[PDB]
C-alpha cells in the first residue's frame, strides 16, 4: 500500500493499556497463582502468551473470569512476566532467572525463554 | 531499574490484537457510523482515542455494547482510522484526507490530526 506509519504508535498503545491495568479499568480476568491474584485484560494476555491464546480461544474457557495456574508456578515469576507483557521490560535477575524461565516456558513466551537460556549459558 | 527490553514487543502485541480483530475474537463493542458497523476491542479504542477513552471510563457508557457516532462522521474516514489504531499504518490519500482529519479531530487522535494538517499545508 501507500500508507504512512507512526513509529511510536505501538509503544504508546501498550503504555495506555498498562495505565488501564494499573487503574483496574476494563480488566476482565483474574489469574490465580498459589495465594496471589493478578488482574489483567484477556486480549493482552493472548497477544503475549501461547498458553493464554489457547485458553481464551477455547469456546468454554473464553467466558471464565478466573484462571488458576499450575501450583508449580511461582507468583513472583508470573508478576515479572505480566509486567513484561504490558511494558516490553523484563526484570531479569540472578535470583529470579530460573523462576522467570520456567514460568515463560509454561506461558509459551518464546522470546523470554530465548533470553533466559542465553543469560544462563553466559554464567 | 536494571530491566532489559525487547524492541519488537509492542509491535508484536499490536499485530496479535489486529489478528484477534480480523477473526472477531473477544471484540466487546460495535461502533455504528451511519449505516456501517465496526467491531472492536474497547481497550484498543481507548488506548488510541481521547474520545473513546472518555466514553469507556464513564461509569454508565463503559457497559454499552453499541456506540453510535455523530451522523456527520464518514464511515470510510472511521475505517481508515480504526485500521491505523490496530496497525500504526495510515492510508492517507488526496481523496480521503479531509474526511480522515475531521474524523481524527472528533476521535481526538492528536498525532493523526498533526500529520493531516502538515500534508494539507504542503498542497
Amino acid at each position: 500500500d501507500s500508507c504512512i506509519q507512526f513509529t511510536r504508535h505501538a509503544s504508546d498503545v501498550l503504555l495506555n493499556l498498562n495505565r488501564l491495568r494499573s487503574r483496574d479499568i476494563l480488566t476482565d480476568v483474574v489469574i490465580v497463582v498459589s495465594r496471589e491474584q493478578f488482574r489483567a485484560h484477556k486480549t493482552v494476555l493472548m497477544a503475549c502468551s501461547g498458553l493464554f491464546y489457547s485458553i481464551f480461544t477455547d469456546q468454554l474457557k473464553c467466558n471464565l473470569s478466573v484462571i488458576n495456574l499450575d501450583p508449580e508456578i511461582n507468583p513472583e515469576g508470573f508478576c515479572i512476566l505480566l509486567d513484561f507483557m504490558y511494558t516490553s521490560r523484563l526484570n531479569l535477575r540472578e535470583g529470579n532467572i530460573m523462576a522467570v524461565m520456567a514460568t515463560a516456558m509454561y506461558l509459551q513466551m518464546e522470546h523470554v525463554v530465548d533470553t533466559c537460556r542465553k543469560f544462563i549459558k553466559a554464567s | 531499574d536494571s530491566c532489559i527490553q525487547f524492541t519488537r514487543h509492542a509491535s508484536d502485541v499490536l499485530l496479535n490484537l489486529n489478528r484477534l480483530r480480523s477473526r472477531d475474537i473477544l471484540t466487546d463493542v460495535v461502533i455504528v457510523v451511519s449505516r456501517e458497523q465496526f467491531r472492536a476491542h474497547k481497550t484498543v479504542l481507548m488506548a488510541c482515542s481521547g474520545l473513546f477513552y472518555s466514553i469507556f471510563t464513564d461509569q454508565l457508557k463503559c457497559n454499552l455494547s453499541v456506540i453510535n457516532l455523530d451522523p456527520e462522521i464518514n464511515p470510510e474516514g472511521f475505517c481508515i482510522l480504526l485500521d491505523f489504531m490496530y496497525t500504526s499504518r495510515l492510508n492517507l490519500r488526496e481523496g480521503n484526507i479531509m474526511a480522515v482529519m475531521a474524523t481524527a479531530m472528533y476521535l481526538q487522535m492528536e498525532h493523526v490530526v498533526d500529520t493531516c494538517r502538515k500534508f494539507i499545508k504542503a498542497s
Binding site: 500508507c3 504512512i4 513509529t7 | 495510515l90 498525532h111
Partner: peptide
C-alpha cells in the same frame, strides 16, 4: 511519521 515514516514511509514503512
Amino acid at each position: 511519521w515514516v514511509i514503512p
